[PDB]
Design a protein around this ligand. Structure first.
Ligand SMILES: Nc1nc2c(ncn2[C@@H]2O[C@H](COP(=O)(O)OP(=O)(O)O)[C@@H](OP(=O)(O)O)[C@H]2O)c(=O)[nH]1
Length: 173
């Protein structure tokens, strides 16, 4: 909505580099699409294995599916935030997200990155609760990075304003 646009544009007064990952079908493309509305987008190829580069306004997003790589290490440096999109209805694969997440955080090049966990598809009945996702990903174990888990619905955009607001609060801090 218009409120997201106000906050998003404010955020883009500076340049940013964000990595957005998650298992296939977590809802990454849907979220980026929401971020793209009424903004300027520039996509470009990557010698990237299956990494897609999407620049929205002044924010460079590097997106890719986990759970399918040495090829990612080159992108970590200078990344301010790692956005992990989680399919809240997938109890079967939450362990995969967890395994991959911790394999990424071990890379010293992501030392200063903030971690935003979007618990997506929270609109779906019987989906895992945000508390459950935090528990199954053992987020409290993360003492060296700032993190925030956010309930969201990429279809409606609900939760995206809050997630973006967390990112803004973390930067000029
Ligand atoms: N209920 C529900 N669905 C969501 C949400 N977010 C994304 N989805 C749906 O999940 C599917 C995969 O999303 P997509 O953004 O392509 O995933 P990805 O890019 O991470 O692989 C899409 O369904 P289709 O492939 O059937 O079009 C999409 O509409 C959500 O918050 N709630």
């Amino acid at each position: 909505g218009i409120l997201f646009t106000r906050i998003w544009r404010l955020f883009n007064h500076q340049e940013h580099k964000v990595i957005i990952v998650g298992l296939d079908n977590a809802g990454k493309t849907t979220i980026l699409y929401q971020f793209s509305m009424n903004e300027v987008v520039h996509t470009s190829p990557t010698i990237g294995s299956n990494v897609e580069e999407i620049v929205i306004n002044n924010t460079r997003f590097l997106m890719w599916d986990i759970g399918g790589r040495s090829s990612w290490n080159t992108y970590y440096t200078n990344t301010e935030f790692v956005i992990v999109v989680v399919d809240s209805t997938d109890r079967e694969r939450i362990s995969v997200t967890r395994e991959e997440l911790y394999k990424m955080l071990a890379h010293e090049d992501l030392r200063k990155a903030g971690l935003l966990i979007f618990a997506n598809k929270q609109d779906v009945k019987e989906c895992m609760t945000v508390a459950e996702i935090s528990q199954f990903l053992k987020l409290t174990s993360i003492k060296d990075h700032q993190w925030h888990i956010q309930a969201c619905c990429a279809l409606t955009g609900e939760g995206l304003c809050q997630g973006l607001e967390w990112m803004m609060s973390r930067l000029k801090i």
